[PDB]
Amino acid sequence: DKLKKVLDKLRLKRKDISEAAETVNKVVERLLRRMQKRESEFKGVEQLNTGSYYEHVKISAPNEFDVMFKLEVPRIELQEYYETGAFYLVKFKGNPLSHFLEGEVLSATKMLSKFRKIIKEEVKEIKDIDVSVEKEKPGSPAVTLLIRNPEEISVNIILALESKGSWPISTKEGLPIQGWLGTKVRTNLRREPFYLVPKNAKDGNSFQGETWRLSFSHTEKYILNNHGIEKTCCESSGAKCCRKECLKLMKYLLEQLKKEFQELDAFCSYHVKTAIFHMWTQDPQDSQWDPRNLSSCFDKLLAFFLECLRTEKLDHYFIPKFNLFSQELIDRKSKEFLSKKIEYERNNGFPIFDKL
Amino acid sequence: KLKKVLDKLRLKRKDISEAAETVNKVVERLLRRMQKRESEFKGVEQLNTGSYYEHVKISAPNEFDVMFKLEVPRIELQEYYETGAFYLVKFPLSHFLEGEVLSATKMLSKFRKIIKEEVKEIKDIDVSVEKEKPGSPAVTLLIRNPEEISVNIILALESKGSWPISTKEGLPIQGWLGTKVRTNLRREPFYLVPKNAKDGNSFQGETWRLSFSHTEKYILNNHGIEKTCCESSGAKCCRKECLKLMKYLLEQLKKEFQELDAFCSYHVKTAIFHMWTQDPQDSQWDPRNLSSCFDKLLAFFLECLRTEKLDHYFIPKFNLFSQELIDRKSKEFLSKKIEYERNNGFPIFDKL
DNA sequence: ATCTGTACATGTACAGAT
DNA sequence: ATCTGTACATGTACAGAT
DNA sequence: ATCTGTACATGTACAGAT
DNA sequence: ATCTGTACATGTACAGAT
Ligand SMILES: Nc1nc2c(ncn2[C@@H]2O[C@H](COP(=O)(O)OP(=O)(O)OP(=O)(O)O)[C@@H](O)[C@H]2O)c(=O)[nH]1
Ligand SMILES: Nc1nc2c(ncn2[C@@H]2O[C@H](COP(=O)(O)OP(=O)(O)OP(=O)(O)O)[C@@H](O)[C@H]2O)c(=O)[nH]1
Ligand SMILES: Nc1nc2c(ncn2[C@@H]2O[C@H](COP(=O)(O)OP(=O)(O)OP(=O)(O)O)[C@@H](O)[C@H]2O)c(=O)[nH]1
Ligand SMILES: Nc1nc2c(ncn2[C@@H]2O[C@H](COP(=O)(O)OP(=O)(O)OP(=O)(O)O)[C@@H](O)[C@H]2O)c(=O)[nH]1
Ligand SMILES: [Mg+2]
Ligand SMILES: [Mg+2]
Ligand SMILES: [Zn+2]
Ligand SMILES: [Zn+2]
């Protein structure tokens, strides 16, 4: 109860899912077409639907869709950027990517800028949908579309490189799903390709325009939809669990707080997604996520997340040495501020869940 | 106890390597011949199946099952007399047709002639082609490493369509392995093998039988309700050991008594599939409860015998214990001999 | 004449709707 | 509890290309 | 189209620990 | 007696090269 009513509020409506997906699929399909037309450099790119809507943890409204446009790049050499584990330079062995080359090195911002120019041109030609292109955001690997379905919808077209080689060594000790999803699943997932998206920092740091960042959105999608230690978890002949509902409630808490308070700008939903992947590793049994224990299940996730904030440690699930909560990324000011806001909501009935 | 019997049944690492190097030598050479030649089975691929590749072979690595699978599009199927598993096939292979009917006997016999020719050319291994068992879908090789090793080479057609409607209700794993696993498995191809021998009551020679050896192998190696069952970071179960004990009990009874000729290890494999479905939780197969697990398997197999009903796990209407397949007499004999061993501490488990 | 990238045809898990 | 729209994986048809 | 290279599942074999 | 850790061995998926 009580948290069940919040989830009722957060539950997406099928009427809205239809209207939104109808428009979104028309726009995405046309953009994917134009990428294959001509001697375009992005010929061959394939679509991958990712993120919370395709993991079924989108909340409130179907107003934001992530879609990777992924391009296989056969012979590629990687160079780690300053032992960060997550950031790389790409290098190469006629070739469509040549215009973005900078002496062996693939420029991310050069690729993205031409990707984006092509997108904007195609968008000019959509005459039956109110759709434009958001101004570029620092740090975004995406070209974001703003659709007015009347209702506002964002579509993030994420540009990605696809390598089918084995994953970079910095992930060797990531994905610690052995006690939970098991060794066969882990091995099979690491047989899948890995992905590189533009870092696009705009900070002024050296190599800024040529650094890429690993993405595991496809793996995360598989894990969200195959999340139980039992194969029948949340299936029609198995037992429902509350894992996704805890992720929804945590996402909602952060979203509500983030739109009230500018102090929380450095925080994003990927921080809560990473924290709950750790909780799912720490508590692997499906019975540690009984729907009847939704309150304490949510409560123990808060407690884990507060400890991550207090101790300033939230390791990337796929790249253990990459701390999303380091000082270099988020001030202790920000963290103590969110720690107190969460602490407050937790001990006063979650008044922010009733906001708006 | 049963632990001690399981130590006996366990294969030796040295034996596995000595047997497999020889077997792989012959098999690659045979698979090469169907391939690098202008043969009508150009295309076949190797599919290793059965107990050795499922890690439930017992006593010795002395029998190997290999599918040579050949893809065929269109391949319209017609069911044989509502039996479920038996079909005629319709429409390189035109040499084996009759009246738009693909004759299993005619394709097997050329398949067999090919293998015999290639076997005559192997001069580095003592290997011969066993006399054909009429019906049987296999061409069987006998190898004397020095040890005797059978290699059954099973001709199969591979089809990519929806599985035939007689399986629609089979593979009832939804509460054990789940719906996603079942749907994924039924997205795999299905196989037909040239199993014949209906004495001489005709249609005999053009019949094929459905094979699910590929699905069974996936199940054997992905058998828990938890994904970690028998993995290095999960808990061991005793499901496979129970299958081994049951196989050995029938193996030992069949050596003794010719009354049990109609019985085969597949009857045991089918029965334990049903019991794994009845008892899906991994905790119902705890290693510490090996005995009661073996016993409840015994009691289910006896119930199958008593009721004369052991449905094909993939084809529910096909009763492997029908009066037409196994005489009522044979099933009461097997009942009495199993009840005997059970009630006396399994003496046959001691004898050599 | 034959070949094939594109898209339709089929089936079902997920989860919202009634 | 059943009915149902979307997403998605795989099998296959054929208009347009060679 | 074929075949090697790699990674890790699944097994057995045995000493040291429990 | 059983459990545990390391070593030893085959099977099998698939990327990448030719
Ligand atoms: N490695 C890495 N991945 C990120 C990061 N931020 C976002 N992602 C990925 O981006 C995808 C979508 O990002 P978001 O739109 O912000 O959040 P979401 O998962 O779609 O959830 P919603 O906010 O409800 O849309 C996820 O599938 C993540 O895998 C990051 O900082 N590092
Ligand atoms: N598939 C996929 N989508 C991503 C990934 N990273 C980001 N996105 C999407 O792109 C949008 C902006 O990208 P970010 O890099 O996360 O934005 P940012 O500038 O770093 O700022 P914050 O999200 O607050 O950390 C997000 O809302 C996601 O929807 C990724 O790694 N994979
Ligand atoms: N559908 C079906 N499959 C069969 C039948 N008999 C044998 N098989 C299949 O053939 C494979 C090998 O058969 P066998 O060598 O007789 O037995 P096994 O499973 O390998 O076990 P062992 O007796 O120890 O060698 C099995 O995995 C079965 O899938 C049958 O009568 N019907
Ligand atoms: N992989 C695989 N091997 C099979 C299959 N069917 C038969 N075999 C092999 O062929 C051998 C003999 O075939 P059986 O199914 O026993 O048929 P049979 O030899 O005509 O004699 P019966 O058992 O009396 O019907 C088995 O021991 C298996 O090794 C199958 O469907 N898949
Ligand atoms: Mg989303
Ligand atoms: Mg066998
Ligand atoms: Zn669940
Ligand atoms: Zn197990």
Please name the residue whose C-alpha is nearest to the C1' of nucleotide F8.
Answer: B13
Q: Residue A317: which of A208, A186, A197 has the closest Cα?
A: A186
Query: Is the CB of residue A14 less than 8 Å away from at least one CB of chain B?
Result: no
Tell me if A120 sits within 8 A of A132, measured CB to CB: no
In terms of CA atoms, which chain A residue is nearest residue B179?
A235
What's the CA gap between A350 and A331, in Å, rounded? 25
Whether ligand 2 lies within 6 angstroms of the CB of A219 is answered as no
B231–A184 CB contact, under 8 Å: yes
Integer angstrom CA distances of residue A286 from A235, A294, B181: 13, 13, 18
How far, in Å, from the CA of A303 to the mean position of ligand 7?
Answer: 21
Give the number of other CB atoms < 10 A from CB of residue A308: 22
Our CA dihedral for A179, A180, A183, A187, rounded to 10 degrees, sits at -130
Residues of A within 8 A of B226 (CB-CB) are: 182, 229-231
What's the CA gap between A111 and A41, in Å, rounded? 9
Q: Residue B87: which of B153, B167, B189 has the closest Cα?
A: B167
Window B:216-235, CB contacts with A under 8 Å: 222, 225-228, 231-234
Alpha helices in chain A (DSSP H): 3-10, 14-36, 52-55, 108-124, 183-191, 217-225, 243-260, 269-282, 294-310, 332-346
Query: Is the CB of residue B281 less than 8 Å away from at least one CB of chain A?
Result: no
Q: Residue B139: which of B120, B114, B162 has the closest Cα?
A: B114
Tell me if B208 sits within 8 A of B229, measured CB to CB: no
Is nucleic acid strand C under 7 Å from A235's C-beta?
A: yes
Question: For residue B149, what are its two tokens?
Answer: 């090793």
Alpha helices in chain B (DSSP H): 2-9, 13-36, 51-54, 104-120, 179-186, 213-221, 239-256, 265-278, 290-307, 328-343
* Residue at token pair 């109808």: A22
Question: For residue B163, what are its two tokens?
Answer: 């599985």
How far, in Å, from the CA of A289 to the mean position of ligand 8?
Answer: 23
Ion ligand 5: residues, Cβ under 5 Å: A 51-53, 64
Query: Is the CB of residue B344 less than 8 Å away from at least one CB of chain A?
Result: no
Tell me if A23 sits within 8 A of A147, measured CB to CB: yes
What's the CA gap between B219 and B202, in Å, rounded? 35
Give the sign of the dihedral formed by CA A158, CA A159, CA A164, CA A165: negative
Question: For residue A191, what are its two tokens?
Answer: 């047989």
The span from the first CA to the last CA of chain A, in angstroms, equals 21
B332 Cα distance to chain centroid? 24
What's the CA gap between A183 and A188, in Å, rounded? 8
DSSP A85: S
Tell me if B237 sits within 8 A of B282, measured CB to CB: yes
A96-105 long-range Cβ contacts below 8 angstroms, 24+ apart: A96/A39, A96/A40, A96/A41, A96/A43, A97/A41, A97/A73, A99/A41, A100/A41, A102/A210, A105/A210
Beta bridge partners of A130: A148
Looking at ligand 4, which residue's alpha carbon is closest to its atom 4? B154
| β-bridge pairing B138-144 and B148-159 | antiparallel
Please enumerate in sequence order all residues whose Cβ is within 8 A of that of B84, keeping only pairs 6 or more positions apart, or say none: B166, B312, B315, B316, B317, B318
Concatenating the DSSP letter of every residue in B18-33 gives HHHHHHHHHHHHHHHH
What's the CA gap between B31 and B39, in Å, rounded? 11
Integer angstrom CA distances of residue B348 from A139, A166, B340: 73, 52, 10
To test the contact with chain A by mutation, choose from B228, B277, B283, B284 the residue with the greatest count of A C-beta atoms within 10 A, namely B228
What's the CA gap between A174 and A55, in Å, rounded? 21
Whether ligand 4 lies within 6 angstroms of the CB of B140 is answered as no
Smallest Cβ–Cβ distance between A182 and the set B176, B180, B231 belongs to B231
Write down all domains in chain A, each with its CATH number in brackets: 12-166+195-216 (3.30.460.90), 227-356 (1.10.1410.40)
| A15 three-class SS | helix
- In our burial notation (b when 16+ CB lie closer than 10 A, e otherwise), range A246-273 reads bbbbbbbbbbbbbeeeeebeebebebbb
Residues of A within 8 A of B232 (CB-CB) are: 178, 183
Beta bridge partners of A68: A48, A158
Query: Is the CB of residue A281 less than 8 Å away from at least one CB of chain B?
Result: no
State the count of interchain CB pairs (< 8 A) between A and B: 58
Which secondary-structure segment (H or E) carries B102?
A: strand B101-102
Tell me if B260 sits within 8 A of B333, measured CB to CB: yes
Question: For residue B351, what are its two tokens?
Answer: 């004898």
Give the sign of the dihedral formed by CA A319, CA A166, CA A196, CA A280: negative
> Largest Cα–Cα distance in chain A?
64
What's the CA gap between B319 and B31, in Å, rounded? 35
Which residues does a gap of C–N over 2.5 Å follow in chain A? 93
Chain D nucleotides near the protein (CB, 7 A): 5-12
- In our burial notation (b when 16+ CB lie closer than 10 A, e otherwise), range B247-257 reads bbbbebbbeee
Please report, rounded to whole angstroms, the spatial distance between the CA atom of protein residue A21 and the C1' atom of nucleotide D6: 8
* Residue B52: Cβ-neighbour burial (10 angstroms; 0-12, 13-18, 19+): buried
What's the CA gap between B236 and B282, in Å, rounded? 9
Smallest Cβ–Cβ distance between A231 and the set B225, B231, B233 belongs to B225
B261-269 long-range Cβ contacts below 8 angstroms, 24+ apart: B262/B325, B262/B326, B262/B327, B262/B330, B263/B326, B263/B330, B263/B334, B265/B51, B266/B320, B267/B310, B267/B320, B267/B321, B268/B243, B268/B301, B269/B216, B269/B243
* Residue B301: Cβ-neighbour burial (10 angstroms; 0-12, 13-18, 19+): buried
A179–B227 CB contact, under 8 Å: no
Beta bridge partners of A50: A66
What's the CA gap between B170 and A60, in Å, rounded? 41
Residues of B within 8 A of A183 (CB-CB) are: 228, 231-233
How many Cα atoms sit within 13 Å of B57 on the Cβ side? Answer: 20
| B88 three-class SS | strand
Residue of A66, A171, A199, A317 to test ligand 2 pocket, by largest number of atoms within 8 Å of CB: A66
What's the CA gap between B279 and A114, in Å, rounded? 59
Question: For residue B208, what are its two tokens?
Answer: 């094929």
DSSP A75: S
DSSP A107: P
Smallest Cβ–Cβ distance between A238 and the set B178, B228, B233 belongs to B178
Please report, rounded to whole angstroms, the spatial distance between the CA atom of protein residue A151 and the C1' atom of nucleotide C16: 20
Ligand 4 atom with the shortest distance to the CA of B191: 31
| A82 three-class SS | coil
Tell me if B96 sits within 8 A of B180, measured CB to CB: no
* Residue at token pair 């993991």: A55
Concatenating the DSSP letter of every residue in B197-228 gives --TTSSSGGGEEEEE-HHHHHHHHHS--SBTT
CA triple A156-A162-A166, angle to 5 deg: 135
Taking 3-state DSSP, the helix, strand and coil percentages for chain A, each rounded to the nearest 5, stand at 45, 20, 35
* Residue at token pair 């590189």: A196
Tell me if B349 sits within 8 A of B252, measured CB to CB: yes
Tell me if A143 sits within 8 A of A157, measured CB to CB: yes
Tell me if A146 sits within 8 A of A251, measured CB to CB: no
What's the CA gap between B139 and B122, in Å, rounded? 16
Give the number of other CB atoms < 10 A from CB of residue A206: 9
Concatenating the DSSP letter of every residue in A243-300 gives HHHHHHHHHHHHHHHHHH-GGGTT--HHHHHHHHHHHHHHS-SGGGG-GGGHHHHHHH
| B131 three-class SS | coil
What's the CA gap between B95 and B74, in Å, rounded? 17
Whether ligand 2 lies within 6 angstroms of the CB of A84 is answered as no
Concatenating the DSSP letter of every residue in A119-142 gives HHHHHHT--SSEEEEPPPPTT--E
A352-356 long-range Cβ contacts below 8 angstroms, 24+ apart: A352/A253, A352/A256, A352/A257, A352/A260, A353/A6, A353/A252, A353/A253, A353/A256, A355/A256, A355/A260
Which residues does a gap of C–N over 2.5 Å follow in chain B? 91
What's the CA gap between B96 and B190, in Å, rounded? 21
Ligand 2 atom with the shortest distance to the CA of A67: 1
